[PDB]
């Protein structure tokens, strides 16, 4: 198994234990309507560090955090058009279904390959750490699914003469 993934995502979840921070405040100088706080960050001392975290040499994460709301973005080794544009027939397909799950910073963001918008609301909405114990790892499983589409698509390459010529 890719076992330094264990150091990797155990340290992700140690960061997401050091800093399960996100809790609310509204206003003290400007309006009560809690914002995309990670976008609208004015100043440092109130808030989490801006950060980036390589897995190797192409692969890395960005995380950035207001004390109440957060970005993630994640980068992948793959770089062929046959890796990218083909899975981007899906990453097109993906984004309306982001509207059916509400926490994407809804784009396949470059330098990385994706991004996320995360907030304190969720901490009050249903549950506790089973949440991040799902999320952080589900995020690998949806990568292992690329292997699922891989043999699928490669077998669509195995559609080819298997129709046209095999008619005869």
């Amino acid at each position: 198994m890719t076992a330094t993934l264990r150091p990797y995502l155990s340290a992700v979840r140690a960061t997401l234990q050091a800093a399960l921070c996100l809790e609310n405040f509204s206003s003290q100088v400007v309006e009560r309507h809690n914002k995309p706080e990670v976008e609208v960050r004015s100043s440092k001392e109130l808030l989490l560090q801006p950060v980036t975290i390589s897995r190797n040499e192409k692969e890395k994460v960005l995380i950035e955090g207001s004390i109440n709301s957060v970005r993630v973005s994640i980068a992948v080794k793959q770089a062929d058009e046959i890796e990218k544009i083909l899975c981007h027939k899906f990453m097109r397909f993906m984004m309306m279904r982001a509207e059916n799950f509400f926490i994407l910073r809804r784009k396949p963001v470059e330098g990385y390959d994706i991004s996320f918008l995360i907030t304190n609301f969720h901490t009050e909405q249903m549950y506790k750490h089973k949440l991040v114990d799902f999320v952080i790892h589900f995020m690998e499983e949806i990568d292992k699914e690329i292997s699922e589409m891989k043999l699928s698509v490669n077998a669509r390459a195995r559609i080819v003469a298997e129709e046209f010529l095999k008619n005869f």
């Binding site: 198994m1 890719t2 292992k144 292997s147 891989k150 043999l151 490669n154 077998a155 195995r158």
Partner: protein, 371 residues
Amino acid sequence: TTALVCDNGSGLVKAGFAGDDAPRAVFPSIVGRPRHQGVMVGMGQKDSYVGDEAQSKRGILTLKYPIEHGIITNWDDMEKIWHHTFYNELRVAPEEHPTLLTEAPLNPKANREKMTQIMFETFNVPAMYVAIQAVLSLYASGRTTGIVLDSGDGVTHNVPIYEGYALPHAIMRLDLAGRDLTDYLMKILTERGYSFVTTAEREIVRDIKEKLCYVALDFENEMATAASSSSLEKSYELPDGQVITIGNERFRCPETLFQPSFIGMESAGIHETTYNSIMKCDIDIRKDLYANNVMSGGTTMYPGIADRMQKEITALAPSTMKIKIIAPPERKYSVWIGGSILASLSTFQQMWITKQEYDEAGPSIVHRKCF
């Protein structure tokens, strides 16, 4: 850290890493897919149960090991099993680590392109080369020179080596495997009067056989004995609470290696057929070869066969020279471990095609106008 070494072949899969003492990634090199209306529809099952899970479910499944023009032909069904390796055995990418692949003698033309098409466009390895499996055995023995038998579940071959220089006309590849045995063997159940005899019981047949079979010591003595005895007959549980007690078949059908002629097949019997390697070989060496007779496979773990085949071979042979016949404990299991340990001679890598060579022309850098 690693470079990738496998029994990618027939029987079970028997893979590990470079340099290990043992293959470990191990389950049948065959897989099943539901033969059924899934009447509890939506019960959350994927379309296959694989080797050990195939067996856990074998009453459910359709399964494949294609035409005897090869071992298989839609190798793109090990398609699935490539992932079943990469994740379901391992959770790793081949694309990470230098890979030791393997293939047999005399594969018909298209093999190595059609292979490497996958192995680099798909398995994307840093760099690789492909071995032939015979001398892997001698590596474990710490040897180079003698006659090497394979008989297996894919195939058979019979392989003279001399620190290399192995004989293109006296190495003897053959389609034969334990694969084949059962077609005669299982017709006997109507002699047994069993109104109940199928495809899926072939694995139990093979079981009982792997538990209790042996090759007859001097077969008409055995036939006269079966005609006069039933201590032969030995008991065996069956899955509802039954037993069957059976056991003359247990060495009767184990004559067919000398008698392919049983199906009316015009092939000579085993050692006689094999001798022709030596007959085509150099003649001088045939003294010294008495000490160099190396024998192995899962198919090789039976009782009685050893002394039989020796005396059988001896019916072909002169006396005159000092024998050693050479067949180790675990010879069945062993071959992957010798081939695993080769990679320690890091020299073995330098042959490697990298993905660049494969990219640039194509695997037209190495395929089969190449020798």
